[PDB]
Amino acid sequence: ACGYSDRVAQLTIGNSTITTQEAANIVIAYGEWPEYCPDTDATAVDKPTRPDVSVNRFFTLDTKSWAKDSKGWYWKFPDVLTEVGVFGQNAQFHYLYRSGFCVHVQCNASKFHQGALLVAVLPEYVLGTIAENSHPPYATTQPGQVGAVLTHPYVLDAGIPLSQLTVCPHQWINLRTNNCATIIVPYMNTVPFDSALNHCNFGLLVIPVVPLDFNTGATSEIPITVTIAPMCAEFAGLR
C-alpha cells in the first residue's frame, strides 16, 4: 500500500487529522464498497440512525510494540470500538448495528530494520483452545481496544494454516519497501443488522511472517499503529 516515494498527505475527518502517505494501493475487501443497508421491514417502521457526528472519524488505537519474538496480534470488530468514544455509547444504546471500516495499519522503522507483517481480515474469526472440552474465555474472544496476542500463530489459534490466510483480504507490510497497509471492509453477515455487543463480524490480524531483525544498537521495538474509521455506520434502536 504505502511506502517510500509517495507524496505525504494530511487527511482529516471531523476533529481528527492523520499524516499518512497517499498511496492508491488500497485493498477493497471482496471487491465491494461499504454501503448503507438496503431496505428491510424492520427499519421501514423505525429508520436507522446514521450519526455522522463524531462517529465517522479517525480512531487511532494504542500503538503495539513489535519485538524480535512477537507472535502476532488480533482485534475483533466491532468490539474494538465498543468501549470507545461515541461509537461506543452509540453501539450500546442501540439494539441493532451495521457498519463498514477503513482499516489502516502503519509502521515506523529505519532502513536498517527488516521484517514483514501480513495484515488480513477474517470474517467470523472463531477461536479455539489447546484442550478436554472448553470454549475460549470472554477475555480472549473479545479483547477490546488493546487487542490480544496469538499463542499459536502457525494455526491462527483456530486450527487453520497461516500459510493460507491470503485467501482473505490481506496486504503485506515489508519493511524493505512499504511501511503501511490499508483495507476497506464492507458489512458481512447473514442478516442486515446484528447486535454490536454479541457478534463480532470479523477480525483484524497482524502476524509477523518474517521476524523483526536489526543490529544491536537500533531501536529494539518497532511501533505498529492501527487507525480505524467507520464507513456508513447505521444503528437501529427499534422505538
Binding site: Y30, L162, Q164, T166, R176, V210, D213
Partner: protein, 231 residues
C-alpha cells in the same frame, strides 16, 4: 391406463442420480437471501490466489513451524552456490501442501495448467545482491552449477532493485493412478546465489525470502475424490 413397461434400473438408488424428491414442507417459504459480498462460484477462483509455500520444510522445523514459511540468504554463502530447490508438484507432498492450491488438488484426480511462483525479499532496505532463479523443464537434469542453470530458463533477480519477482511454470499435468503413482509431468525450480549478500555496517547479515504460489487462468481440474488429508 397407459401401457408402460418397467425397464432394468427400476427401484434402484444411485447416490449420483440427480432426481426430484417430494418437498417435506410444501407450505414453507424459506427465508429469502440477501447480499453477502465474496460469493464464490468456482473453486478455481480460490486456486488463482497466492498462498505461502513451505519451501523451508525441514525435519528440524517441525517444532517451530513458523520457520517453514520462509527460507534465508546470508553473507556466508559464496557466489554461485545453490540456495534452495523444490519441484512444481501441487498435488504431491512437500512444500505445496501448505498452499490452498495443493490442498484443493487432493480433492481431484487430474489437473493441468500454468502456475506462477512469486518470491519476496524481506531483508534490510540497505541490502543488495543478485539471486538466479531457474526452471528445469520436466524430464530434465537438475542444474549442477550456476553456469548450467543460466543456460536454461532463468531469471536474474536483483533484490536491490525489485523486492519481489514472479516466475511462471509454463505447464504441468497430472493423471493420478493406483498399483499409488502420479503421472506428474513437472519441472524443478532452483534458486542460486549469482552474487553474495552485500550489506553495509549496521544491517542484519541474514535476511529471508517468502515464496507464494498460485495457479494461472488456464489451470483446470477434473474427477472429484475425497481427500486423504484428514482422518
Amino acid at each position: 391406463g397407459i401401457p408402460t413397461e418397467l425397464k432394468p434400473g427400476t427401484n434402484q438408488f444411485l447416490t449420483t442420480d440427480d432426481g426430484v424428491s417430494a418437498p417435506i414442507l410444501p407450505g414453507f417459504h424459506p427465508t429469502p437471501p440477501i447480499h453477502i459480498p465474496g460469493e464464490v462460484h468456482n473453486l478455481l477462483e480460490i486456486c488463482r490466489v497466492e498462498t505461502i509455500l513451505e519451501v523451508n520444510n525441514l525435519k528440524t522445523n517441525e517444532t517451530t513451524p513458523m520457520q517453514r514459511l520462509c527460507f534465508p540468504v546470508s553473507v556466508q554463502s559464496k557466489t554461485g552456490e545453490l540456495c534452495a530447490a523444490f519441484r512444481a508438484d501441487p498435488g504431491r507432498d512437500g512444500p505445496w501442501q501448505s498452499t490452498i492450491l495443493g490442498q484443493l488438488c487432493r480433492y481431484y484426480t487430474q489437473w493441468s495448467g500454468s502456475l506462477e511462483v512469486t518470491f519476496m525479499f524481506a531483508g534490510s532496505f540497505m541490502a543488495t545482491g543478485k539471486m538466479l532463479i531457474a526452471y528445469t523443464p520436466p524430464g530434465g537434469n537438475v542444474p549442477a552449477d550456476r553456469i548450467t542453470a543460466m543456460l536454461g530458463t532463468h531469471v536474474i533477480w536483483d533484490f536491490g532493485l525489485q523486492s519481489s519477482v514472479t516466475l511462471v511454470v509454463p505447464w504441468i499435468s497430472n493423471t493420478h493412478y493406483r498399483a499409488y503413482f502420479d503421472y506428474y509431468t513437472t519441472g524443478i525450480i532452483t534458486i542460486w546465489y549469482q552474487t553474495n549478500y552485500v550489506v553495509p555496517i549496521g544491517a542484519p547479515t541474514t535476511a529471508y525470502i517468502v515464496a507464494l504460489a498460485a495457479a494461472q487462468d488456464n489451470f483446470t481440474m477434473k474427477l472429484c475424490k475425497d481427500t486423504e488429508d484428514i482422518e
